[PDB]
Structures are given as structure tokens and as C-alpha cells.
């Protein structure tokens, strides 16, 4: 059974095993079972923690259901792959990646009033190619007033740093005026419409280039793994893999009664059904219930 | 798909584009005489304008039956696609067995013949491992777990550097 | 044995989801 905070997180989820746990829960609620009162407890740090481990149970089967567009030509397999991960973000409780990483910035730097500390604990989330090209401009402006540039905005010592960091943001390719004029906004709905259509022209060219950089690293890893494997003799390969397969079974067999280990060996039995159902009719495929 | 769909028998396809299947619709104002012809078979029914609108009421929602997962099968299809590019260059290997006769054995230097018999034993090493396609499904499981951990990001599954740098420009070049 | 289902055949197999569930069932009752 599910602990009723999982089943609230699997309602908008769309993978198979989360929906069959929802559907057998909704079948219990048709037979008059009482919906348990969800907890108005678990203060802010615990609520952020169990949300992190409930989103990762919607993300983890969902990532395995998204076909990578490896070896494809064009932008639409990469835009499909990106859009399936957007919808996996929305199904798991994430907001937009712009709204999710900006919340990560302002949470990590809620204590900072100097820019050199803002550029130092937002280090894990920006490029080191971009963290360095802002630390060059920062340590020239701090070599200009010989005082630390403040995270104030109304300080003029920040204003000519932000005017030079805007010149860095174009030096990466980021439209710094377009991004700012979207997350600020405008009064009329017609002049904010023309800035959303050119933010989303950047944003779609942005998230495609992160998906396409993820595909080009899986393509390069798989071509590196294969060429290391094609240089082996066949007798080495079959016993390297049978050693790795058998070691990984006994890690699931020595695990006493754990839910992941029963689900591991239930899926080894379901792979062997797939190989057996294909052997019965190979031009048909596996047998589904129809 | 959404809940309500607004297509059917208006601006519809009137005819087929191939020759493998022959489509003929005859639209009146209310109904339509479709005539389909595929192979030897033929069928012709009457589709109402409010019979195609009930079609998108209960959705099909196709989903892939994979051996392991859709992710793994897309990595394994790429390794099968990469093994084909290596098999195509073992296709262009010169037929060394045309020089196995004893008029090449005895005319040749005894060390250039042992190199030739080693280069023929090497092709059978390369060819018997590029056609070991039952090993590609376990090479795909060496790519999956490191990819799947990058998708378990604490920010977003679809986050990357270009977006997170573009959202630092909004965060830094606004007031504090 | 044959002809399982469709909604049972749509499951991604060797996902984690149950290590993630296991370390959520021994962390949240331990940090509360």
C-alpha cells in the first residue's frame, strides 16, 4: 500500500506502476473506505525533504520512459526529449526550470549582501565558464573602487558592475535585456506579448541546447563503451557480462525482504517473460492482453 | 490530447495520396460516403459528421511495450546503430582466403606469411565480436544509471547550464 | 502465463523508485 502522501503525488503522474497504485486506491475509495486525513504537520525542513523524495519517485520511473533521441538528425527529436522532461517536471511537482533554478539562487544567497559571496555559493548552479567571466569583471570593479561590490542594486558601485556583467551576458550569447524584461514584466498586455515571444525564442533555444548537450554526451559515452568492447575477444565479453549479471543478482538475492529487491527479481522474471513471449511468435512480438 | 476535439468531416482528407490504398469520400451536407480499397478488399460505410466527433471521446493513448524500458531500448538501439557502422567497415575487408593456396604459401617470405595468417585470424576476432549483438543489451545498462542520476537533479529534471546561466542573468542583474 | 496486460507491460523495469522509496521510509521517520 501507499502512505497517502505518495498517492497524492501520483495523481497527476502518468507512469504505469504509479497509476495502478492510484487506480487500486480509487477502487478502495469506491467501496466506502475513508480517505485518511493528510498531515498538517512536518515543519518546513521536513516538508522540503519529503517533497524531494516524493518528486524523485515520479521522476525516476518517468526518466526511464523517455526515449533518448540518440543519433537523430534535427531539432524536433531533441525538442520532444526536452518537452517530455518538462512534463515530467510538472508531473513531479516542479515548476518551470527558469522558476526552479531562480528559486535555487535566492535560497542559497539569502544571507549575502556582497557580490563575491553571491558568485561563490551559486557556484554549483552556473557554468564555471560563466562563473569565471563574472569573477573577472567583479575583480576589476573591486580593483576600481577598492571596496567590495555590494548586492544592493541601488549602490552605484553595483550599477557599473551590472552594466559590465550585462556585457558578459551578451558575450555568452544570453539576451540580458530580453530575460530581464520578461521576469520584470510590463503594464500593457501587448508590449509584454512581444517580449514573451522573444524570451521563449531564447528559452527554447536554451533548453534544446541543454538536451542536445545531454544527448551528445550519451552518444559519446556509448561510442566509447562500444569501442572498448569491440576490442575484446568474444570469450572475454561473455564472461565479463555473466560475472556482472550474476554479481548483480545476488545483490538482489541477499537483500532480505526489501521492497526494491522483490521488485528487482520480479522484473528479471518479467524480462524472461518478454524473451519467452517473443520466442512464441517473433513476427507478432510480445503477447499483450487484448 | 485534450478533452474536446474539433476536427472531423470538415476540411477532411478527401482522397488517398498513395496507390497502395484507394480512398474515396463523397461528402454530402450531413453524412459522407467513404469508399476504401486496400489490396483485394473493399469497404464503404456512411460516416456521419457527428460520428467522427464521437471518435475522439475515448482516447487510444498508445504506449510502448519495452523489454526493459523505453530509455534502455533507445540506448540499445543506438549501440545497434553504432555496431552497424563498424560492421560496414568489416564488410569492406579484402578476401584474404583467396591467398590461402600453396602457390602463395611457397612464394612468400616465411615471416610475411605468418603475418598474413595472423591478419586473417584477427579479422575473425573482430567479426565475431561485432556480431555479438546479445552483448549490446548489457552495454546499454552501463549508460543508464549515470544518466538517470543526472536526471534526479534537485533543481529540475530538464535543467541545464544554458538555462541556469540565463536565469543567473535575471537573478544578478536585478536588485539583490 | 501468456498475454499479461498492457498497463503491466508499460512499467519501466530497472528504475530505482524503490530505493528512493526505501530511503524515504527510513529517513522521514528518522528525521521527524
Amino acid at each position: 500500500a501507499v502512505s497517502k502522501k505518495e498517492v497524492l503525488y501520483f495523481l497527476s503522474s502518468k507512469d504505469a506502476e504509479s497509476s495502478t497504485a492510484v487506480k487500486s486506491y480509487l477502487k478502495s475509495l469506491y467501496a466506502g473506505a475513508q480517505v485518511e486525513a493528510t498531515e498538517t504537520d512536518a515543519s518546513e525542513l521536513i516538508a522540503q525533504l519529503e517533497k524531494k523524495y516524493l518528486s524523485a519517485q515520479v521522476v525516476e520511473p518517468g526518466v526511464h520512459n523517455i526515449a533518448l533521441p540518440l543519433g537523430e538528425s534535427g531539432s524536433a527529436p531533441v525538442k520532444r526529449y526536452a518537452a517530455e522532461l518538462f512534463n515530467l517536471g510538472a508531473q513531479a511537482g516542479f515548476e518551470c526550470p527558469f522558476i526552479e533554478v531562480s528559486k535555487k539562487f535566492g535560497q542559497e544567497t539569502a544571507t549575502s549582501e556582497t557580490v563575491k559571496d553571491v558568485l561563490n555559493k551559486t557556484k554549483s548552479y552556473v557554468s564555471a565558464d560563466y562563473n569565471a567571466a563574472l569573477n573577472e569583471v567583479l575583480s576589476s570593479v573591486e580593483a576600481e573602487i577598492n571596496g567590495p561590490v555590494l548586492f544592493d542594486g541601488k549602490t552605484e558601485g553595483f550599477k557599473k558592475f551590472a552594466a559590465k556583467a550585462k556585457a558578459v551576458a551578451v558575450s555568452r550569447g544570453l539576451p540580458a535585456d530580453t530575460i530581464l524584461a520578461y521576469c520584470a514584466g510590463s503594464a500593457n498586455e501587448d508590449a509584454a506579448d512581444k517580449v514573451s515571444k522573444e524570451f521563449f525564442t531564447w528559452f527554447e533555444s536554451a533548453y534544446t541546447a541543454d538536451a542536445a548537450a545531454e544527448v551528445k554526451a550519451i552518444e559519446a559515452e556509448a561510442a566509447s563503451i562500444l569501442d572498448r568492447h569491440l576490442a575484446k575477444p568474444v570469450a572475454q565479453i561473455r564472461k565479463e557480462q555473466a560475472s556482472a549479471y550474476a554479481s548483480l543478482l545476488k545483490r538482489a538475492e541477499t537483500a532480505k525482504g526489501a521492497k526494491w529487491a522483490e521488485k528487482y527479481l520480479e522484473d528479471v522474471k518479467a524480462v524472461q517473460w518478454f524473451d519467452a513471449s517473443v520466442a512464441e511468435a517473433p513476427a507478432s512480438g510480445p503477447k499483450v492482453a487484448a | 490530447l485534450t478533452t474536446f476535439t474539433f476536427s472531423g468531416l470538415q476540411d477532411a482528407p478527401v482522397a488517398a495520396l498513395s496507390g497502395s490504398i484507394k480512398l474515396n469520400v463523397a461528402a454530402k451536407a450531413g453524412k459522407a460516403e467513404v469508399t476504401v480499397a486496400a489490396g483485394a478488399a473493399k469497404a464503404a460505410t456512411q460516416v456521419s459528421a457527428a460520428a467522427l466527433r464521437k471518435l475522439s471521446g475515448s482516447k487510444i493513448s498508445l504506449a510502448e511495450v519495452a523489454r526493459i524500458s523505453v530509455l534502455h531500448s533507445s540506448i540499445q538501439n543506438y549501440l545497434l546503430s553504432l555496431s552497424n557502422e563498424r560492421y560496414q567497415l568489416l564488410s569492406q575487408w579484402p578476401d584474404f582466403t583467396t591467398m590461402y593456396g600453396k602457390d602463395f604459401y611457397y612464394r612468400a617470405h616465411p615471416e610475411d606469411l605468418k603475418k598474413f595468417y595472423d591478419a586473417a585470424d584477427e579479422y575473425y576476432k573482430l567479426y565475431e565480436t561485432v556480431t555479438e549483438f546479445d552483448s549490446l543489451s548489457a552495454l546499454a545498462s552501463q549508460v543508464v544509471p549515470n544518466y538517470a542520476a543526472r536526471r534526479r537533479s534537485t533543481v529540475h529534471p530538464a535543467i541545464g547550464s544554458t538555462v541556469a546561466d540565463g536565469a543567473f542573468t535575471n537573478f544578478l542583474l536585478s536588485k539583490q | 502465463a501468456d498475454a499479461k496486460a498492457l498497463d503491466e507491460l508499460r512499467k519501466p523495469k530497472f528504475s530505482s523508485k524503490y530505493l528512493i522509496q526505501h530511503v524515504s521510509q527510513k529517513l522521514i521517520p528518522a528525521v521527524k
Binding site: S224 | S153, A164 | -
Partner: peptide, 30 residues
């Protein structure tokens, strides 16, 4: 065909580490 199960998160946001071109098309052409 089966993988080690992992339950850990990615806290950084990095580039995905493109590996190098392995020399096997150029070794098998030699």
C-alpha cells in the same frame, strides 16, 4: 542487462562531460 540501482541526487548543474573519440574506426582502417 540489469543495472546497479542508485538513489542519489545531482546537486550541481554542470556540463555533461562529452567523452573523447575512441580510435577504433582509425584502428580498424589500419
Amino acid at each position: 542487462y540489469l543495472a546497479p540501482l542508485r538513489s542519489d541526487f545531482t546537486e550541481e548543474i554542470t556540463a555533461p562531460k562529452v567523452a573523447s573519440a575512441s580510435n577504433l574506426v582509425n584502428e580498424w582502417n589500419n
